[PDB]
Design an enzyme around this catalytic site. Structure first.
Site: not given
Ligand SMILES: O=C1Nc2cc(Cl)ccc2Nc2ccccc21
Length: 266
Positions: A116, A34, A19, A13-16, A17
């Site tokens: 932020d 996370k 998610v 779902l994400g980068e930074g 470790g």
């Molecule tokens: O809950 C999320 N939902 C998401 C679901 C999709 Cl389809 C894309 C991006 C995120 N964005 C996130 C980014 C960091 C942590 C969690 C998420």
């Protein structure tokens, strides 16, 4: 019930470790995990419970790796609902801004500043409900009803208030108000007004000179623009507060119909 504590990692779902999306083996419940200020992030997350704040389910420590179990928002980021150089329809933007204000009122009420706020950190659930995300830069600005002035450089330059670059100390709440104003600008114009709020930035100088016949301001209607004129005020002591944002004419302007509900005729 056996296997109910087992979750499968099915998507990044994400980068930074990083998610990952986790799905429960038994119930198929979706949560965001996370993988990793971390001790402070868990501490602040434990205090949070609001419908416009990403829910914290708990944490686990497997040696050097920390696992944070958070609410999965299937609608993704607000950032991806903003069309470049266009924005989005004004009623959608107003509904997202109302939910952002509810979330920020909640956080400030318990003495927490996010620090932020930007569309990448505003997540949407399956019903397009906005949720404030990532408390990694967040801090306590009010404790035992005593306000603590901040001095640490936190945030993302296009969204930071000008006092953060000009003053040694500043109040937390106007800083979050300012970033919400830049978020509102992005939703209505599909562009960021400046790289940073400094006098060296021509775009920022133009705004203080009230040259609203230039972009992004010429794409924004006079009613939400009058609100932006009250938010994007350089002096944080003269900047509009959230209780007064809630009294603004555009904030209270009827624009949007409820969620499409099923209906038949005859
Ligand atoms: O809950 C999320 N939902 C998401 C679901 C999709 Cl389809 C894309 C991006 C995120 N964005 C996130 C980014 C960091 C942590 C969690 C998420």
């Amino acid at each position: 019930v056996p296997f109910v504590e087992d979750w499968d990692l099915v998507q990044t779902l994400g980068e930074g470790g990083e998610v990952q999306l986790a799905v429960n083996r038994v119930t198929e419940e979706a949560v965001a995990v996370k993988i990793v200020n971390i001790k402070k992030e868990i501490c602040i997350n434990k205090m949070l419970n609001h419908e416009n704040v990403v829910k914290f389910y708990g944490h686990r420590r497997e040696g050097n790796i920390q696992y944070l179990f958070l609410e999965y928002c299937s609608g993704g980021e607000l950032f991806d609902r903003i069309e470049p150089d266009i924005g989005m329809p004004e009623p959608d933007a107003q509904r997202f801004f109302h939910q952002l204000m509810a979330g920020v009122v909640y956080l400030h009420g318990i003495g927490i500043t996010h620090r932020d706020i930007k569309p990448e950190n505003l997540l949407l659930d399956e019903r397009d409900n906005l949720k404030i995300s990532d408390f990694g830069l967040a801090t306590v600005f009010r404790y035992n009803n005593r306000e603590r002035l901040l001095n640490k450089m936190c945030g993302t330059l296009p969204y930071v208030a000008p006092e953060l670059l000009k003053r040694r100390e500043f109040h937390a709440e106007p800083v979050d108000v300012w970033s919400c104003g830049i978020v509102l600008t992005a939703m209505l114009a599909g562009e960021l007004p400046w790289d940073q709020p400094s006098d060296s930035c021509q775009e920022y100088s133009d705004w203080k000179e009230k040259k609203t016949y230039l972009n992004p301001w010429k794409k924004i209607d006079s009613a939400p623009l009058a609100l932006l004129h009250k938010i994007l005020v350089e002096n944080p002591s003269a900047r509009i507060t959230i209780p007064d944002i809630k009294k603004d004419r555009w904030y209270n302007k009827p624009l949007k119909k409820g969620a499409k509900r099923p209906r038949v005729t005859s």
